[PDB]
Amino acid sequence: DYNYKLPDDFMGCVLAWNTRNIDATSTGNYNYKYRYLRHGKLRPFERDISNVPFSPDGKPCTPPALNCYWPLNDYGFYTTTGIGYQPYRVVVLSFELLNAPATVCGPKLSTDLIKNQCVNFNFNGLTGTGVLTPSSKRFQPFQQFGRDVSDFTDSVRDPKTSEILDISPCSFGGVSVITPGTNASSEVAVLYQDVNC
Amino acid sequence: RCTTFDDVQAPNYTQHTSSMRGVYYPDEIFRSDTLYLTQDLFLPFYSNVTGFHTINHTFDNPVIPFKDGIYFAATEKSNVVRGWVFGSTMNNKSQSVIIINNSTNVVIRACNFELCDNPFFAVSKPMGTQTHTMIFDNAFNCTFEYISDAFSLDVSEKSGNFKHLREFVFKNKDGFLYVYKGYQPIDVVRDLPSGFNTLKPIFKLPLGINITNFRAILTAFSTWGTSAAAYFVGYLKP
């Protein structure tokens, strides 16, 4: 991890699986290489393949002179070693939920939009509900997800039909019942609904 | 090829301001009538911006340190500064992405390169024809490949005020390379004018490399000559 850094905040999925049958041979596989000489910690999602002998103070080296080791400890995986020395093929699947034109989708079938209120909209993993009326907003082609004055799913591009539409949420609010006194009259209450007729 | 010109004059590091430049859309988000805050890497207003005036005698593209992100202005009515190499030390040991244009198509490609000490295309001064690539020769342990769309370019030398302007911001961020396009018409002699313009994102290059240094690539009008079309560099700050 000092030669392959994964950042703390940004995500990924660690997929490792044992290969004692495949990548572990009793003569050893010295093709699977491994670095140990590196000046400082390595930046996340980066690498440096360069096989250069490093001087710890910093000098142009020439191996095998003093303090000019090769930067590699190339391990040969045997099929007779313990579990801590078995070869593991490790695939790290980083993701991008950065809302570009949505590339890697899921197997869900795509329905069609309705202007009607309160639709469980799922525009590329953006769940929720609301009135889904089309509107007139500019939407440059490098911006596909508009927000409110402070941070909400407000306006999206329909990723199939490339249409501009904003979301008003479902018509919430308080409900205020209005009664005369029940000892005076248990007659039926009248009610608000705090939105609209 | 390692073909250096004879009359090559070093830069004097002429300082100018970053007046109202280096502003980009920080995210893929439509925002309307809001006074929104953002802490990303940005070019500060009124910074020390290093100039590089490539007149017929003075040839200016040194190996400039990158340092957490750069701004790149280019006064180009003449379309000269066509190419960048973002490497660690720009040797055959380290990896260097090369972002050039072959006057019809932008090429982004990252590998180990033996870097030329002075690369240029064999381009005549009145005609402006791109014939011989002299930028990459050797390419081994290569990882990244990209070839863009097609759109034409005028290589030849214009005159008077600059009819275009090339604003760029490169960010080494999370093992990527964010590229930001700047395209506006101006009218100036050699100065970087105090003009505001917003940049758009174009490339999110999934490379992942220690970028410490860089060098711009000049399309020299070839014992050589260049137009009065300078370029500027500035750094970014969080």
Note the run of SSEs of chain A as H and E: EEEEEEE
Name the chain pair with the biggest interface and residue counts per chain. Answer: A-B, 29 and 26 residues
How would a textbook summarize the main sheet of chain A? 3 strands, antiparallel
Class based on secondary structure composition and strand pairing of chain A = little secondary structure
Number of strands of chain A: 7
Helix content of chain A: under 10%
Biggest sheet: strand arrangement of chain A = 3-4-5
Q: Report how far the terminal alpha carbons of chain A are from each other.
A: 62 Å
DSSP strand content of chain A: 5-15%
Over the alpha carbons, how many angstroms does the gyration radius of chain A reach? Answer: 31 Å
Shape of chain A: elongated
- Counted by DSSP, the helix tally of chain A is 0
User: In oligomeric terms, what are we looking at?
Assistant: part of a larger assembly
Explain this structure to me?
Chain A has 197 residues and is mostly loops. Chain A has a domain at 98-172. Chain A is built from no helices and 7 strands. Chain A has strands at residues 14-18, 88-92, 145-146, 155-157, 164-166, 177-178, 190-191. Chain A has a 3-stranded antiparallel beta sheet, with no helix packed on it. The N and C termini of chain A lie far apart (62 Å). At the A-B interface, strand 3 of A face strand 12 of B.
